[PDB]
Write an enzyme that holds these catalytic residues in place. Structure first.
Site, short mmCIF file in Angstrom:
data_model
loop_
_atom_site.label_atom_id
_atom_site.label_comp_id
_atom_site.label_asym_id
_atom_site.label_seq_id
_atom_site.Cartn_x
_atom_site.Cartn_y
_atom_site.Cartn_z
N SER A 69 9.96 4.20 3.66
CA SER A 69 9.03 3.53 2.68
C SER A 69 8.00 2.65 3.36
O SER A 69 8.31 2.07 4.39
CB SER A 69 9.75 2.56 1.70
OG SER A 69 10.65 3.40 1.01
N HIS A 91 7.15 -2.84 -2.67
CA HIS A 91 8.63 -2.86 -2.91
C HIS A 91 9.43 -3.14 -1.62
O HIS A 91 10.62 -3.43 -1.69
CB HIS A 91 9.11 -1.50 -3.54
CG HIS A 91 9.21 -0.30 -2.63
ND1 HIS A 91 8.34 0.66 -2.47
CD2 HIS A 91 10.25 0.04 -1.78
CE1 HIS A 91 8.79 1.51 -1.61
NE2 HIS A 91 9.97 1.16 -1.15
N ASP A 130 2.10 0.24 -6.05
CA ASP A 130 3.05 -0.23 -4.99
C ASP A 130 2.26 -0.30 -3.65
O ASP A 130 2.29 0.62 -2.87
CB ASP A 130 4.19 0.81 -4.97
CG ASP A 130 5.36 0.48 -4.04
OD1 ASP A 130 5.49 -0.68 -3.72
OD2 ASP A 130 6.07 1.41 -3.71
#
Ligand SMILES: [Ca+2]
Ligand code: NA
Lengths: 36, 252, 10
Positions: free
Chosen positions: B198, B43, B99
């Site tokens: 992230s 992502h 992910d």
């Protein structure tokens, strides 16, 4: 790199290689119902 | 990272920063698994709801850092990418299932006291360490509060939570390729990852052979450090065959 | 906020 680890992976120059510990790793080992 | 502390020099030598060239900005965190491969969250590169789809030529990888905004002359290394590989079944339409993404560097990086790779877990290591109650560590240069950026790399240690508790804290459908971590409202300890963290690593230290292994990748959360909420991570061991495959298909 | 990085990395 891959499969189960590699050569000298995970051993830090400034810590494990010199037998020195960082300030909070003890907290981790103590949670695996204690280590050593 | 919310409620974490400044890292020590050389504490996480596998931490990588994904930096955008124009505008020059911090995008995500990532990890070094060999002299030519970096691991991150898909992502961070592809997310159509927000018109996000980055390419090789739009990024730089910075390795060996401590400070968040300064060019650490003679210490950090900056590399360009050769190829980006996103998991074929990454689900950005529903819950960010699978992910994960791999990036190949143009040239190999040389290790130093500040640059060293982390290990990827094997079935037996995964089995013995991914247990509720055991703590892992997350690092990153992300925000300090939900709504406040650090000057140096931050660190926080968090416990893995039982799957039922993770599932009852949200409306999203959780899968076997995710695990959640964090303190319960009742444990009086806080900590969480936040915007900017992230793609970074969730690691554990093996008490059998003293090596550090990367068990998860920072994936998603609902707010940052909210009570009753937890952070979700990609389960690296369940996606390892995909990893092995691209590496010995496209390099080493 | 970020400091400039040398031109041969662009
Ligand atoms: Ca639920
Ligand atoms: Na929480």
């Amino acid at each position: 790199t891959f499969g189960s680890g590699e050569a000298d992976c995970g051993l830090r120059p400034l810590f494990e290689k010199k037998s020195l510990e960082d300030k909070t790793e003890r907290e981790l080992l103590e949670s695996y119902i204690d280590g050593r | 990272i919310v409620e974490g502390s400044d890292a020590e020099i050389g504490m996480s030598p596998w931490q990588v920063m994904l930096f955008r060239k124009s505008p020059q900005e911090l995008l995500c965190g990532a990890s070094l698994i060999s002299d030519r491969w970096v691991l991150t969250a898909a992502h961070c590169l592809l997310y159509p709801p927000w018109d996000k789809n980055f390419t090789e030529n739009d990024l730089l990888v910075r390795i060996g850092k401590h400070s968040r905004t300064r060019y650490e002359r003679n210490i950090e290394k900056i590399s360009m990418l050769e190829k980006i590989y996103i998991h074929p079944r990454y689900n950005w339409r529903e819950n960010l299932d699978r992910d994960i993404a791999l990036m190949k560097l143009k040239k190999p990086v040389a290790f130093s006291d500040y640059i060293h790779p982390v290990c990827l877990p094997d079935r037996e290591t995964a089995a013995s360490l991914l247990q509720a109650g055991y703590k892992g560590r997350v690092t990153g240069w992300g925000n300090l509060k939900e709504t406040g950026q650090p000057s140096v790399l931050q660190v926080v240690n968090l416990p893995i939570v039982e799957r039922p508790v993770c599932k009852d804290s949200t409306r999203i459908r959780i899968t076997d390729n995710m695990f959640c971590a964090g303190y319960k409202p009742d444990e009086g300890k806080r900590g969480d990852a936040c915007e900017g963290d992230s793609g970074g690593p969730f690691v554990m230290k093996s008490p059998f052979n003293n090596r550090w292994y990367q068990m998860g990748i920072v994936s998603w959360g609902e707010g940052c450090d909210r009570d009753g909420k937890y952070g979700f991570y990609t389960h690296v061991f369940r996606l390892k065959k995909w990893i092995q495959k691209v590496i010995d298909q496209f390099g080493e | 906020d970020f400091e400039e990085i040398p031109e041969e990395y662009l």
